[model samples]
Target chain A: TGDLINTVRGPIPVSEAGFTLTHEHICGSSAGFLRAWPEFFGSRKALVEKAVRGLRHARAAGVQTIVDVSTFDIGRDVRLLAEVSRAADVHIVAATGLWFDPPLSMRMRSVEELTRFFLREIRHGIEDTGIRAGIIKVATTGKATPFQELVLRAAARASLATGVPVTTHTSGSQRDGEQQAAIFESEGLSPSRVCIGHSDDTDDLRYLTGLAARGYLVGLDRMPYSAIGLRGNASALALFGTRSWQTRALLIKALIDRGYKDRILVSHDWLFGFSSYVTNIMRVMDRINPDGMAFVPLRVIPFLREKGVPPETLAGVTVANPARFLSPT
Target chain B: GDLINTVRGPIPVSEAGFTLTHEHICGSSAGFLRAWPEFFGSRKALVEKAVRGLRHARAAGVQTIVDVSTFDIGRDVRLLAEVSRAADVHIVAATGLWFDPPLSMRMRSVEELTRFFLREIRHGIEDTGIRAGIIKVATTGKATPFQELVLRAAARASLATGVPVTTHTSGSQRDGEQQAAIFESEGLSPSRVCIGHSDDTDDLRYLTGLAARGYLVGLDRMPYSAIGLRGNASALALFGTRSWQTRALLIKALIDRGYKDRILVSHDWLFGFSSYVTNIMRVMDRINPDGMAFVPLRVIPFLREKGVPPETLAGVTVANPARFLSPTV
Candidate 1:
């Protein structure tokens, strides 16, 4: 009950018998990718609020624990995580790691030293406030930037020491999720501990299937916002349903059938409010009306339901699975 | 008044109140600024809905309109004007020569261009049964390359045809007012036209000053999508401050003020989908569970009284906007 431990619905047991949304984030942004552009980092607040809003919506959808993967300076708004955890009424797990973007990162340490910091956060507690991160987070850019590979290698080592497992941020358009597992495996981390994020943003089904085949966690969330061009209903139906919504559903079922059930997670990667700059920009959109809050999770599940997903599977993705992944060993 | 023209809203006759807040399908986009990308034409549904949507605003509140479509690319699509004529939405139409980025070249000088455009637009009513209402112009990101050229054209044309002029200010930045003043210095009538899309920013103080200044302020894009805070409600709340309401009332209290007639109102509904979806979405965010889009006209006439009305409510809604968007014709 210290800094190392947090709760959704206030500290439920480790074995909640429900699904866990491993890749869900309560607050984060791609600003780490833009650390060279100082102005971009200022959008942290908007990103935080966006994620919190999504988290609350996830709460309504019956999602239990949420693993927020905004680990690096590109994200990792610890204060924001605290606020969002309070607001969304869900156990929020924070991440500790770095984006592959280098020269503009934590200057105090090498990859191994950073991994130690992560394990300390996972094992001891962050800020000495007992908000223990349940998992270690890391990311890889497509083509695996040297910094990305180094951070990932560190993550694999951290996973071994802390028994906390690891999850990853994969670039949206590539087979990085699958490649990330191989990177972790080469460093002696088991594929089962690494959940692949944003695997759904690519068109290569063979790639996504390959990640699942490697026995890694696959994230197919961010669906509504994942189209190549256009947005809203038409684009969503086209992008997520080129194979037919039923076929997409069957695809998920097949992944589960192939023995990758516990590794899948669900969430929209919208970070709502945290930083001053982004909060101001987001207010241009969010505070426009009271209605902005209802769109994300509300629209997401219904979309999946309409896409021929079974109710039980929807529940598993939205609720059961997320809970299980976030539970303690 | 025949159905030969489609006007914008919350209208009447006044010297400083000559601008259309919303008009037909000029342009649309998905997220970021896509300049060089070939300008995709509006959807069939977008065109038809905007033509009708303009009429709805005209019936409720507008006068001489500057259809804010700029540039020659998508600017040539005037099929909606044909429908507007049939629908009895009287309008002071608009037209410009070209888009900035991907297509940023001009064949003629600004003065020659204005003369050319004015001659063609004035003749449009007779030659093609489509009336060119106001002089249409636009500014992009920090401003497109054609900003100065179009502003010069608008000024020259306004003097030539006695038709009011209007220009679209791109982005949410405060630069539009300066752009508007450039048009003013170019010999355009201050009370005749305006700076458009100033409402896109969440900066209320800036917008309030623009409204007070004699420029026709465009508080457009109401009830369309979740713009977060740079939205209508937040902007309205900014304008609806106690002191602001008092100031608005003081100006409106002078019934002989002729202020109400100068102001305008518009949905800025770029699509039927924008309003239909946004209205439904906003309606769900009520503090208590309630019907969607049911708060206002469906509730009571005094719904405006709840937010931030002065001791006298008369000057708040009707009078302020009337003074702002009035027409010279």
Candidate 2:
């Protein structure tokens, strides 16, 4: 009977999670590694300060909550999120569920057991901390492995039992969203409760529109959209900067005009810290989105306004839709 | 009488300051890199990586690193000497066998194995003039008869040359106690033995029992969220294992029980030239970027937060390692 959603500090009413960025990460250090070797991550305090700074900018630009999709393998740090939430006065909703290429231990879990792991976090708490996960995140690698298929089904089951929505990581060109939709549908989860992420990686409006028409949330979550496929190829990364934020804003405009505003989530799947292994990639990303999560609000929103998309529709894209999607069933 | 022997040269006990009790400098699937150097980037790159990691460890106050890389796990005394020279860190190379002994070696008697280990310890490994400093024996799950046989040879070798004994044990099965008992039966004092991978288990009784019996509990395997070079073998070893967070706790627990002097912490980290192996290690490094220095950088600070005595952290990371590696006569 209540509109409650879980945040890192505790539960908050859904209405308070205004202007939410539905995808982002705080710190990706292994649960133990952060405490063990914070230096590798520029020390926890420094990273926390960096996160607070980025979050404050986003808050200043009107974001109040963020859905952290850094799952277990990605080094999801609930404590860091809680600290940043308090420091920046932002509501941070942490996620639980495996990401692409599930780790060794997770690979061993039976589908039922994986679902129980997710439900326990959603219903009880994560790792003995009373702070619970608010979202169920699952992913596909442009195609589902047999194990990934099991994970998708498991996330759907956890969502059904706990009433939290399921968000996904996808390679949109492979139509992973469509694959996830069929799987979630088969598992009895509503399409509206699932946000098929990385839909911004592609410019194929028909595919994204099909996902929205089928009632699935399309996550145009990558800001500076040209950063999608240039992993490890520096030359491509070098040239792709001026290629596409405007194109993506126009795509958002088209979606709104086509009346799927409620089924769209826009945010930068940007991250604060990652393993030094990916530091080069992140360096380029930081350069591109210097405003961090605030990029959309301070820049893209104004661009959309310049293009004549209505203000209420902008609010719906940034605020009302995410709150509704994250609101517990 | 107990001066420490390292690959470069023997050093006084006081010189072995802030030691990492267990580690591997690029040890990978025994002889796998040499057999197929194509898969590995190159031997030069592998050694280069080792030099870089060791140089960092040196910067972090680590004076000694005991590499428990047995022959089956690709122990290369010459390369270790090269890395020791380049990184300017004292490295103790090992002579013995991993838990999985070769079939041909398994056929030989314990005395036969003992003789080979002694020669490596005394006469130097393969005429490289780089003598091994410690003996590494191993046991999987329960003590296999052959593993026990290998264990006996390690114990026997301890009596012959006065070189200290360490081990690779199936920590989850609480194999340390059995290894200790074997050494004890052979009249090898528990003080001469460092039971390795003791952090892999949650059993305090096992650790305390070993500590009570005067054995050094090798709380190595820092940042254990990694797998090996193969397909199913690595898949099976890592699934359902302890996370680094759980492993790190054993440090505080052991110290609380007054076994800080009996504890030896390390990162059982390894690397290789093989592309597959290097990439996996890169992923693990991303997970725990402190890499080899996780014990000093992350774990010691964590112990401090938990109210562990400041000096006790020093002794665990430093003096205790000095005590454990001091050769016995």
Candidate 3:
């Protein structure tokens, strides 16, 4: 098995464990730790409290496991992540690799160097703290910045050693996901072993279809996340209700029908929102997907089924597909 | 009754005959006409062709019409409006401004412009004996600043004029419907106005639902002329079988749902790019995959052969728009 790192934690063991939500984040700060250090640490407690609230919310929502893909610039809030996961009774998975845009610290290195670093994290478990990550996480800026490209190559090397599947943050625009998958193919990585996050922002069906067609996971996880800054992800979904939600669901359905089922994954991309960043993420999520939005996941399958979407297809987005991506490498 | 500019040929004396339904001298310019004035000049054949096209509309139906065109940059309504009256089309002219952006600070202010618009409109109508239209229009896409501001002002002026409003929507943002609803909410009677570009979506449920709410619907990209970029650049002339069939069904279904009381069908025809000026229909062959070009005109006959009632067709094609426009006019 490859030595890629598992950034999240898992192994609670129970198939009654309905499903796993791959490609998520606990907390993220785009302004960088140095920039946000003062504000984040000062507000840490208040932030954890809100995350605790979210952890409880996700548990109630029937999300059994959450694979958080926050990396470099946005992540490594291990202690807090452990707190939320344990509190929520949900298996929390963290990522260990790099976020490319803004050239986070994990980037800015040669592919060989990134690979060595990834192998070290996978083998030694994040500076030997023993709080082992449950999955490998990597990200792509719309363009695979030099750093992102290096991370991709490094991720493949790490995956070969650790056997942990990889998940990526491909911001929606142009062909980030496709480019990432192309990089994986070129590196001879298993496309099926990678989760390509945030493929929803673009209206290009062909791009999404192509990604899914190539056996790479396409995360429509942010369907509810788009409106995060307001009602946050949860509230936005709730406010838009069944009718509006169906437009997206149906579009996703179209993606699945276009033969990308094995590559489909859904997530809410939840994060703690007490600090300014988390608060903004939460506010957007609340406004975008809000409380009422939860009803969509519960109602979507039935609605689509009623609308003639097959159970197997629903399982593609809600089940089986995620299992394959998050499964041991 | 206030002078109304109908896009169609002149309306007859009775039988709701005086209504000018399908008519336009100029239209949207998002694709061309922006970076090149030569492109605009190249469409003169289309304009001359429409004069003959209007004759067909006049012969079949219509009397006493107005050429509804914006006076803002790139749209010279005066020229066509002048020609229409000389042709005895009883042109009900427009004196409204167009929507652009405030990308620069040199533009005229809305308040200052409205004063000018108010004067020109009343004077034009009074001086030429060309009836002034009641409807106001604007567009959105990269949503120019001028478009949004003018639309708001149009809504406001529409209320002030008690002109019973109409609007020109650009592209398929779906927000056009929302804009019309906003106008309706702003005290404009739902029946008194229409939200153009309703033909953008062929979803029967969506289109019919809008009709049910009493907003006027437009499918003006009808009857392609030979000279258009797509050789009669119209959805009716272009779209594939699935698209064409779907649209036809939507038109039929709206009448089926008894929402026939609120539908208006017209070609927001422009003369500058048509092959036939007097009732000259554009050849759709260049725009579509050859076989699909004639879907618009062909679909009507197909509906007839399929035994669709003529009265129902007339209601959708004519009666609805006339009534909706007349409600406030």
Best by lDDT: 2
Best by TM-score: 2
Q: Which tens-of-lDDT digit does each residue in B1-114 have in candidate 3? A: 422343233343233443444356544321112212232343455455545655654554554444555443223444456456544455555545444221111133455345
Give the lowest summed-lDDT range of ten residues in model 2 chain B.
B31-40
Q: Pairs clashing in candidate 2?
A: A36-B298, A37-B298, B26-B271, B40-B273, B40-B274, B41-B273
TM-score of each: 0.41, 0.55, 0.44
- Every candidate's CA RMSD: 21.5, 19.3, 22.0
* DockQ for each numbered candidate: 0.01, 0.03, 0.01
Candidate 1 chain B: worst 10 consecutive residues by lDDT?
B29-38
Candidate lDDT values, in order:
0.49, 0.76, 0.54
Per-residue C-alpha lDDT of model 2 across residues A60-119, encoded as one tens digit per residue: 888888989877656566777788889999899988888763433356457886787788
In order, the B-chain TM-scores come to 0.59, 0.91, 0.69
Best by DockQ: 2
- Which residue runs does candidate 1 get wrong by more than 4 Å? A1-11, A16-20, A29-57, A101-108, A226-262, A274-297, A303-308, A327-329, B1-329
Rate residue B282 of model 3 by lDDT.
30
The best-first sequence of candidates by TM-score reads 2, 3, 1
Docking quality tier of candidate 3? incorrect
